[PDB]
Amino acid sequence: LEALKSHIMAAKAVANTMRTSLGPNGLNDGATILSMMDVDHQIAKLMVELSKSQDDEIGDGTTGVVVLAGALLEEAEQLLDRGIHPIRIADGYEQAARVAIEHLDKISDSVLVDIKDTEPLIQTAKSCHRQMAEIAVNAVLTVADMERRDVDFELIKVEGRLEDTKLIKGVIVDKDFSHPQMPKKVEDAKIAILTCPFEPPKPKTKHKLDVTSVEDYKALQKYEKEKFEEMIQQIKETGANLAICQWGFDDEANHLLLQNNLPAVRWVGGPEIELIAIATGGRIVPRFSELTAEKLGFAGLVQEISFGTTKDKMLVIEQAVTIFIRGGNKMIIEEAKRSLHDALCVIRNLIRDNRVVYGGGAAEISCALAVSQEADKCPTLEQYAMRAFADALEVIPMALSENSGMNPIQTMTEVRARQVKEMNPALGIDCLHKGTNDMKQQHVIETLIGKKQQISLATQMVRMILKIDDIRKP
Amino acid sequence: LEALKSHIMAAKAVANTMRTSLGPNGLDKMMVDKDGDVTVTNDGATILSMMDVDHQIAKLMVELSKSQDDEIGDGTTGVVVLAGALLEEAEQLLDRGIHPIRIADGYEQAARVAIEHLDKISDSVLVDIKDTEPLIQTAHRQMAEIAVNAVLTVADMERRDVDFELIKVTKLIKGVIVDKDFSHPQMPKKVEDAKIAILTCPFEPPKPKTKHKLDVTSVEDYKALQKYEKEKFEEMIQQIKETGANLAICQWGFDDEANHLLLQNNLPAVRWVGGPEIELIAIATGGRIVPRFSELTAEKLGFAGLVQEISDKMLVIEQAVTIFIHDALCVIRNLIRDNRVVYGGGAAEISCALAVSQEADKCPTLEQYAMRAFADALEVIPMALSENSGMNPIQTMTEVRARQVKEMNPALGIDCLHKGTNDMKQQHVIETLIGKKQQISLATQMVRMIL
Amino acid sequence: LEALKSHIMAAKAVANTMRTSLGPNGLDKMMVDKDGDVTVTNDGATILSMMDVDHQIAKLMVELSKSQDDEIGDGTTGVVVLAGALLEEAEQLLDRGIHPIRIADGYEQAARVAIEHLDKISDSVLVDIKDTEPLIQTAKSCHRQMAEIAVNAVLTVADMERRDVDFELIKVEGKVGGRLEDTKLIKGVIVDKDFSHPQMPKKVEDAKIAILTCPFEPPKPKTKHKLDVTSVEDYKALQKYEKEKFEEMIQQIKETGANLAICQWGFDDEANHLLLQNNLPAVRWVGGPEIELIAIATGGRIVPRFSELTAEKLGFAGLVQDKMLVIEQAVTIFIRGGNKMIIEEAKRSLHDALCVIRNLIRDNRVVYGGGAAEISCALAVSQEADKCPTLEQYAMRAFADALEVIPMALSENSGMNPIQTMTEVRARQVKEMNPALGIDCLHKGTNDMKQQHVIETLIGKKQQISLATQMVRMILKIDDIRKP
Amino acid sequence: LEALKSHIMAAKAVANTMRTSLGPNGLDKMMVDKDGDVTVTNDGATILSMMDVDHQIAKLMVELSKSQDDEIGDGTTGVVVLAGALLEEAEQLLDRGIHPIRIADGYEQAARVAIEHLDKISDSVLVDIKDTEPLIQTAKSCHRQMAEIAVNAVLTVADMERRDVDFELIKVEGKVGGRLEDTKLIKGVIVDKDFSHPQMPKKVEDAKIAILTCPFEPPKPKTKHKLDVTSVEDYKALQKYEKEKFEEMIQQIKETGANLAICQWGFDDEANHLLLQNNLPAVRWVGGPEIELIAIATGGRIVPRFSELTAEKLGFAGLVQEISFGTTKDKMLVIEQAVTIFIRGGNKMIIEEAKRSLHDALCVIRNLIRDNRVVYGGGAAEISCALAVSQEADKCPTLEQYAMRAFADALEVIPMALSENSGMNPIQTMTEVRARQVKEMNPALGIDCLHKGTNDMKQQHVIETLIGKKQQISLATQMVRMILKIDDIRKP
Numbered sequence A: 001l002e003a004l005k006s007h008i009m010a011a012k013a014v015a016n017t018m019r020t021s022l023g024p025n026g027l028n029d030g031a032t033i034l035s036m037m038d039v040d041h042q043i044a045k046l047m048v049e050l051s052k053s054q055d056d057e058i059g060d061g062t063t064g065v066v067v068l069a070g071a072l073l074e075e076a077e078q079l080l081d082r083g084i085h086p087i088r089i090a091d092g093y094e095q096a097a098r099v100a101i102e103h104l105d106k107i108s109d110s111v112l113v114d115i116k117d118t119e120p121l122i123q124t125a126k127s128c129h130r131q132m133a134e135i136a137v138n139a140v141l142t143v144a145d146m147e148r149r150d151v152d153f154e155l156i157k158v159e160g161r162l163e164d165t166k167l168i169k170g171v172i173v174d175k176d177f178s179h180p181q182m183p184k185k186v187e188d189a190k191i192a193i194l195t196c197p198f199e200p201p202k203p204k205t206k207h208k209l210d211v212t213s214v215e216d217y218k219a220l221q222k223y224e225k226e227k228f229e230e231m232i233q234q235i236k237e238t239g240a241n242l243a244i245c246q247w248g249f250d251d252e253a254n255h256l257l258l259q260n261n262l263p264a265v266r267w268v269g270g271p272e273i274e275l276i277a278i279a280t281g282g283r284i285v286p287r288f289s290e291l292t293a294e295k296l297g298f299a300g301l302v303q304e305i306s307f308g309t310t311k312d313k314m315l316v317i318e319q320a321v322t323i324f325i326r327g328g329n330k331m332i333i334e335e336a337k338r339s340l341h342d343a344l345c346v347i348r349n350l351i352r353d354n355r356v357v358y359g360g361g362a363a364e365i366s367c368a369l370a371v372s373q374e375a376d377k378c379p380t381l382e383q384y385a386m387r388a389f390a391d392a393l394e395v396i397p398m399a400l401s402e403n404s405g406m407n408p409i410q411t412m413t414e415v416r417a418r419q420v421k422e423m424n425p426a427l428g429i430d431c432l433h434k435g436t437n438d439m440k441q442q443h444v445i446e447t448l449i450g451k452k453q454q455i456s457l458a459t460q461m462v463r464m465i466l467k468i469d470d471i472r473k474p
Numbered sequence B: 001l002e003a004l005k006s007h008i009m010a011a012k013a014v015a016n017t018m019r020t021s022l023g024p025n026g027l028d029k030m031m032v033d034k035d036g037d038v039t040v041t042n043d044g045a046t047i048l049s050m051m052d053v054d055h056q057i058a059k060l061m062v063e064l065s066k067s068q069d070d071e072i073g074d075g076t077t078g079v080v081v082l083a084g085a086l087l088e089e090a091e092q093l094l095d096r097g098i099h100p101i102r103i104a105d106g107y108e109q110a111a112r113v114a115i116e117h118l119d120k121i122s123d124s125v126l127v128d129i130k131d132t133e134p135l136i137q138t139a140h141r142q143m144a145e146i147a148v149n150a151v152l153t154v155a156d157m158e159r160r161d162v163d164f165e166l167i168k169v170t171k172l173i174k175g176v177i178v179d180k181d182f183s184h185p186q187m188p189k190k191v192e193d194a195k196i197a198i199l200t201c202p203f204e205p206p207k208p209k210t211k212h213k214l215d216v217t218s219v220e221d222y223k224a225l226q227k228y229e230k231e232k233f234e235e236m237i238q239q240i241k242e243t244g245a246n247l248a249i250c251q252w253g254f255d256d257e258a259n260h261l262l263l264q265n266n267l268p269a270v271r272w273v274g275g276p277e278i279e280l281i282a283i284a285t286g287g288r289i290v291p292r293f294s295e296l297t298a299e300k301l302g303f304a305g306l307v308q309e310i311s312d313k314m315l316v317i318e319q320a321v322t323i324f325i326h327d328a329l330c331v332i333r334n335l336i337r338d339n340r341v342v343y344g345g346g347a348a349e350i351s352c353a354l355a356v357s358q359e360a361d362k363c364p365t366l367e368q369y370a371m372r373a374f375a376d377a378l379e380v381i382p383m384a385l386s387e388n389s390g391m392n393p394i395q396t397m398t399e400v401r402a403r404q405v406k407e408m409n410p411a412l413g414i415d416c417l418h419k420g421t422n423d424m425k426q427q428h429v430i431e432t433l434i435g436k437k438q439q440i441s442l443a444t445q446m447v448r449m450i451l
Numbered sequence C: 001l002e003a004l005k006s007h008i009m010a011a012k013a014v015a016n017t018m019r020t021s022l023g024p025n026g027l028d029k030m031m032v033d034k035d036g037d038v039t040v041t042n043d044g045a046t047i048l049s050m051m052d053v054d055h056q057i058a059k060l061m062v063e064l065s066k067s068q069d070d071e072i073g074d075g076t077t078g079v080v081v082l083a084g085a086l087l088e089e090a091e092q093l094l095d096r097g098i099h100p101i102r103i104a105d106g107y108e109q110a111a112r113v114a115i116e117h118l119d120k121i122s123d124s125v126l127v128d129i130k131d132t133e134p135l136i137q138t139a140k141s142c143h144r145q146m147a148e149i150a151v152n153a154v155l156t157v158a159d160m161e162r163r164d165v166d167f168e169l170i171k172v173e174g175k176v177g178g179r180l181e182d183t184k185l186i187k188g189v190i191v192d193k194d195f196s197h198p199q200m201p202k203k204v205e206d207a208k209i210a211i212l213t214c215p216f217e218p219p220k221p222k223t224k225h226k227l228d229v230t231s232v233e234d235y236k237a238l239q240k241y242e243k244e245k246f247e248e249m250i251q252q253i254k255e256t257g258a259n260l261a262i263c264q265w266g267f268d269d270e271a272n273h274l275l276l277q278n279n280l281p282a283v284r285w286v287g288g289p290e291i292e293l294i295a296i297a298t299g300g301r302i303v304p305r306f307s308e309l310t311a312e313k314l315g316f317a318g319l320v321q322d323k324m325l326v327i328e329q330a331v332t333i334f335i336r337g338g339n340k341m342i343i344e345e346a347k348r349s350l351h352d353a354l355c356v357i358r359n360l361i362r363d364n365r366v367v368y369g370g371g372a373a374e375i376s377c378a379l380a381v382s383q384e385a386d387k388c389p390t391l392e393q394y395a396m397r398a399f400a401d402a403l404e405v406i407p408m409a410l411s412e413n414s415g416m417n418p419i420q421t422m423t424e425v426r427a428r429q430v431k432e433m434n435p436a437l438g439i440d441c442l443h444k445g446t447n448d449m450k451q452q453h454v455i456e457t458l459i460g461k462k463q464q465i466s467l468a469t470q471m472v473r474m475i476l477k478i479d480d481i482r483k484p
Numbered sequence D: 001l002e003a004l005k006s007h008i009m010a011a012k013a014v015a016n017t018m019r020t021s022l023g024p025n026g027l028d029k030m031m032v033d034k035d036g037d038v039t040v041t042n043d044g045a046t047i048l049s050m051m052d053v054d055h056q057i058a059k060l061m062v063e064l065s066k067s068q069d070d071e072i073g074d075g076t077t078g079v080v081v082l083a084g085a086l087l088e089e090a091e092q093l094l095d096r097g098i099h100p101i102r103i104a105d106g107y108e109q110a111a112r113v114a115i116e117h118l119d120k121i122s123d124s125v126l127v128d129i130k131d132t133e134p135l136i137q138t139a140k141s142c143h144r145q146m147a148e149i150a151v152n153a154v155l156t157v158a159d160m161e162r163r164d165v166d167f168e169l170i171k172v173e174g175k176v177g178g179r180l181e182d183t184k185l186i187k188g189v190i191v192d193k194d195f196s197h198p199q200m201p202k203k204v205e206d207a208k209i210a211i212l213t214c215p216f217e218p219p220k221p222k223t224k225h226k227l228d229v230t231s232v233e234d235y236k237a238l239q240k241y242e243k244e245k246f247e248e249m250i251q252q253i254k255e256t257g258a259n260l261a262i263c264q265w266g267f268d269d270e271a272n273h274l275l276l277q278n279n280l281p282a283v284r285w286v287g288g289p290e291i292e293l294i295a296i297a298t299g300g301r302i303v304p305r306f307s308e309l310t311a312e313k314l315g316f317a318g319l320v321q322e323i324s325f326g327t328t329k330d331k332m333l334v335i336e337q338a339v340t341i342f343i344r345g346g347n348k349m350i351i352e353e354a355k356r357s358l359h360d361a362l363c364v365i366r367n368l369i370r371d372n373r374v375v376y377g378g379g380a381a382e383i384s385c386a387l388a389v390s391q392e393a394d395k396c397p398t399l400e401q402y403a404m405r406a407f408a409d410a411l412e413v414i415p416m417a418l419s420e421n422s423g424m425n426p427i428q429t430m431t432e433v434r435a436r437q438v439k440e441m442n443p444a445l446g447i448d449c450l451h452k453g454t455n456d457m458k459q460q461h462v463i464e465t466l467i468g469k470k471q472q473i474s475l476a477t478q479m480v481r482m483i484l485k486i487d488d489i490r491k492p
């Protein structure tokens, strides 16, 4: 049994590590903290990969996920001391999780779309953020489904006065394309995406190619050039226009492309190939034998663009959008991308589910209330498990008050008392010493599907850990 | 949790290290580096540009005090000292049970109080004519006469205020001067209307990428080989001469009769210049750099009006000035951005401490205490100065503060040079409003980040 | 704070070493004497008595628990196990950040709530005519006999005409060797110590007894005194002097009647012979308690000098006859059994019975045990806790949980699933409105503790909850243990 | 200077151990007795009485505190807490370069400011009629009897004649067993010590008491000699000799008409036999104290010589009674002329809480007789005094300025500690309470460390006796001054 308590102490150590980074006064962004911190325990490795890739790619609030999981396990230990089997604790945790998720529907205030309604909600995820809200709303709406379904994913990425921030109709990419004397504007680009090397086909037998004179040296250069010309014709045989290429060719070879009118980009990175292959839909060609008119990107416009000193190229009309934040100072960016990411994510969740619950611990407290209600009407030991789930739900408001210098148990208990007395499920922690506790008066929303993903994912992690023993590491 | 007092102890150790080098009576520091010479000097700008990094917070003290202040002001030592004082008081606040967030917020509010109070203390300096010069005498007046014009040549003087870091070191040159002669003197010693071709590429024949082992037999093929690579070199000369070409600046060299190959082709060049010289010329003449192996175009060439060799070589009619033979140019630039000044010697810190104290006396939430702490933190600048001049620190500082309240003179402050009547006004100890604002705001950013 | 958590750990260990011996299926625990015998027995009173302690907190617990509850009767184990539960909950409250003083205050609140609720659970028992015993067979084959012996012994030895108190001059003498049920109630006192010199008559009518604590020594002098015998005539004069003063002692005793004369110290084998030639018969080597029992039972005197003996102070006993003392001015119970362990166990159960009777005389209200009263008090405490704002709230709820350790322990001691049985009995108690519903740790089929008759005395349970709350309050308020 | 900062660390250690035991919610401190019982109680006087006396600075604080405050008042904890606060504040002034003498002089200045401000804060209380009793309940659930017992104890042994100062003539005897309500008021004296014999009359009425300090011993020569008895007849003659002189001393006592005779020192096993058969009730082996109580209570003079007394120097206790308490027994003197309080409670340690609590009540009443002015506690007087000290501090030039401000802050340790001892946020609660004192102009507003009701200390009736607080701040300033002026601690 002790292995379970060891796991509980490990995951509890992770959650306690990430408690102080919860809330606006955190000490952060738990997504980056988990994405960077290295973990020794396998249970700590399992705290990540479940909180990171499952929640950062759907919603946000990863810190709340790991903290809630740590509280759940910490209560589950005290439940283990009474002799309750871990399967019972996990089942009760699942039942209480159902209760809370259902209570989210009862707390939820619904917001509409298509006329503001989301942009003002985006002003909360941060003048400095009105134009960014506009760019996020129009960005998601540009690549949104909206033919009911209400599911559209991140085909949108951001590149590094902020009033000059643009929405790029297609895809922006670095790398001026090989030799400036090439046509700076390719119209209807039949892109050839190649991840293959540019070397003559070397025979696979004993070489020792003893070139004895300068004449045979120049002839060797002429052969090495001839094979490359053959490659140019092998590419232009199925749609020229452009040729995205990882690997380079250097000065002598570049000309041959220019002379043969085949615009091309030199040794792009890992991305910018996947980026352009997704934008233009053209399949990548990795081999020097497997390219045709079927594996070609279908760009409508490709052009090189300068900014005084450096220059990058854009490709628009592609078969699906990017955000270009030009603002200078370069200390602002990578942080405008965080609030803008929260914008795009909150918008995506609002398209998926247009219901919001009010944060600051309010929804946590009222969910703990509902779970406690469904616990007081139950026999079997799962009763204690449900009450423990409520107590674990009440760690988010406690953690907020803690990180804001307030007395956690006192302020949390008083706020819960106000939630029961005033029938207001939006009363929570102040966190900023800013007026009242009414979160709707403070504009703190958290998108029902996001909170539901928090509770559900934390429950999944906790149940998985509540099983697991023996860890057979070599 | 305990890591806060530890990090505060480390950054405070960095501050106490540089406490003795503050003021005109500051102590020098040996500071040798890797198996080389020794550079004895005070002025914490170069001290923090060196100083091995012990803690991660110890490095965090640099580049915030260094890159944020040296590029706007110069008072880096005051920045790190003030930061160490703010953290040292922040520890005492952490003893009372204050949360660090409230300490940082109170430090921000008090910083607003002081920065705004500087506007009230500020004296105005006039521009557009001669007598910005004598002010510079505070930071053989010729240097001043050189500095002012040196900025004014590359300054806007209208409302955009950008002239940053384009000047370097008894006369002023309207362009840029660089070393490294013309490489083979038979070249034109005065290139006129120079379409400078700045290439940072190697000069080698394009070797193939397959198995070689060139087995040249009998001197015949040896001479044929030398003639071959010289032929390709001539092809390169025609690659540059195809685009303006008037002059060619190269990071790599040739180092034989290849110079003649240029001379016979009439393409003057310069051999083996460094990076922080190629960039200097490239921005000076506005000529894009060519990195790839002689894949250039006519737009990536400099357009310098005149470049000539002198008994080194000079580049004029460029764009963008150099002084032919900083402590003044920074003050001048700050005066152009904002012509308001405050009086140093710790006076501005004492009056700002008074303003923060007053604005803290009527205050609710615990940030009150923090603000009070901030005031005391500022008063470390006078005391330290007194300490560096052998005077009783708290005695002298208390007297100067009491006089600043009694006489309503926000310029009374430490006369560490033991010269005169404690006034700083008729002592000409000036500190340029933007500089002091940058000090307070920067130290506040460091402290609030460590918290 | 860490020192307080260590104190909670030591106290919790003391409780864990005790909860296994709670209830009728309680385990035994050897507890060897000081390089001597053993005493295999549950009943946490003797356990805490014979237990030596290491930690000062444990020492404090062992002193405070026996300081009151054992002087009341049963429940000495419930004090330490309930204290351990309260401290174990108080730890989980400390981890939340609640100050210890708030936990203690909430524990006092819940203590008053539960103690007030016991008055509502309470029933009533009558004390004037018999059939108190049905409440006594619960305290302990021959339960009716022992119950009648205890009730008669207490009702004989009691004020009861107001004052409502009982002073235990009841002596329980257990003689190994008998037939399990030959236990008799003797209107008088019985002690061992045979008559000195066998030829003294084993029967004294109208025995006027002289109780002495003086040594049978020649009248010694004071000051320095060095005695030098210079001739055989002075040696014989010494022996004759001591015989003279001795017979002076005997005649001095017989001047006041003195049919018998118990003495605490011994004789000389020459002494008891001179006592045989006179009609004095005496007993020797009795002992302090055994001469106090005779002192108040016979209307004695206990004089430490023979020469100051007067007839007015003699203790009258109608018949002195081990040796029995009947007809005097005081009752004793003579337990008889078989294989060395019939008694001592009969002594223990009889002690429990006498305690129950005395407490019933003090307060004739009872609550039904088996953990039922603890569950009902827990329901009341949590109910009042839901109607409380400040942090004390939590503490009160914790107190409730702490109470529910008494069922869980009992269940645990009878092989049942503690959580499941305690929860089932708590739900059955909520729905049936039956506060006399508890753990059936004897496997009798029923759960109603009114049936099966499990009694616990109101003031006994009150003393349990109050004393345990006091101990937990002290342990929670202690730090900086000096140890000079 | 390093020695001085070491002294500050030791003193502030003594303070840090005791600020947790400040207020009604103070922690208990186990402190066992060397190899015996324990004494678990929150009380600065007792905690400093035990107190691991290690550092000479700590022993110095323990010396001064009990040397004055506990001998005149009671507030022994706030002296050491405030002293530790003042030294901890003085450390940062030492680091600023301020000389210790300037610091101590500043603490004296601000201490005078606060002591003078207490007079402004002071309120009043009446005497002789029922007004003192209720404000004894605050010296703490049946404490209504505590007030009555203490007030009747001070007013029975009345000063009444003015000049207004009086203590000793009150003993508190505690016998374990019972409940707190069993505490009864006062008639005369109650001491331990059974008589001297079982058959001694347990009730000696109209007892003319003989108070002796002599031994009941036939006087020895004292010259180094050896008593050699050569025959049994001379042995008997010795017994008759010393019995004879014993009886001479007995009849020497009862010739003055002594119905009772206390002895204290010498009393053999033959002596009480000869005193019983002579019908002279007597008690032996009584301490030095509990005899002058008999001398003043029964108006008798202490007879020194081996029975050279007259009826002029005898007692006159109306009824002497021996009382049993289960197994032990005490001796009480009623109808005398000096009183004593008999306390019951049981549970081995309740009769200690209630004992020193009653002591605190008696001290409060005595201080009210001295000066019937009080300030309202709960840290209110400390906060108001801190406000005054800061007011005078901002209007001061030389470095004493800083010291004065320090003193202010030091005072505010008393509220914070209280807040800390009640689970509240100390800095926030103290700050808010002080701001409320400024706005509402209510100097009787301090930490509600009992969590019951409002904030103003006029309700809850928390009084402090002006003389007590004045002597508190004065004594703490004495400690801090002495420690500041100390270095070099030699200690051979």
Ligand SMILES: Nc1ncnc2c1ncn2[C@@H]1O[C@H](COP(=O)(O)OP(=O)(O)O)[C@@H](O)[C@H]1O
Pocket: A021, A022, A023, A024, A026, A029, A030, A031, A060, A061, A062, A063, A064, A065, A359, A360, A361, A396, A400, A429, A430, A431, A432, A444
């Ligand atoms: N303005 C606000 N006021 C109160 N609580 C907030 C506010 N903004 C965010 N929070 C709370 O902070 C919690 C965690 O967010 P944060 O600490 O920023 O990182 P993450 O979103 O990764 O958890 C959320 O549960 C939310 O309730």
Ligand SMILES: Nc1ncnc2c1ncn2[C@@H]1O[C@H](COP(=O)(O)OP(=O)(O)O)[C@@H](O)[C@H]1O
Pocket: B021, B022, B023, B024, B026, B043, B044, B045, B074, B075, B076, B077, B078, B079, B344, B345, B346, B414, B415, B416, B417, B429
């Ligand atoms: N002549 C002077 N009289 C008084 N103070 C001076 C004088 N010159 C410089 N100072 C003070 O010295 C401080 C620090 O300057 P210094 O130690 O030379 O390097 P840095 O400017 O990098 O801190 C300034 O804040 C200024 O107030």
Ligand SMILES: Nc1ncnc2c1ncn2[C@@H]1O[C@H](COP(=O)(O)OP(=O)(O)O)[C@@H](O)[C@H]1O
Pocket: C021, C022, C023, C024, C026, C043, C044, C045, C074, C075, C076, C077, C078, C369, C370, C371, C406, C410, C439, C440, C441, C442, C454, C456
């Ligand atoms: N026959 C019984 N049926 C159910 N419970 C019982 C029975 N006898 C005793 N108990 C329970 O056992 C508990 C402990 O009693 P015991 O261990 O004998 O001594 P103590 O009362 O000192 O703990 C009591 O609280 C009582 O409720």
Ligand SMILES: Nc1ncnc2c1ncn2[C@@H]1O[C@H](COP(=O)(O)OP(=O)(O)O)[C@@H](O)[C@H]1O
Pocket: D021, D022, D023, D024, D026, D043, D044, D045, D074, D075, D076, D077, D078, D138, D377, D378, D379, D414, D447, D448, D449, D450, D460, D462
């Ligand atoms: N009922 C109360 N309410 C508020 N404060 C109190 C109360 N009783 C005592 N105090 C405070 O406790 C402080 C210290 O008293 P205490 O802890 O009993 O030890 P001492 O009397 O030795 O100082 C006093 O300054 C007083 O202000």
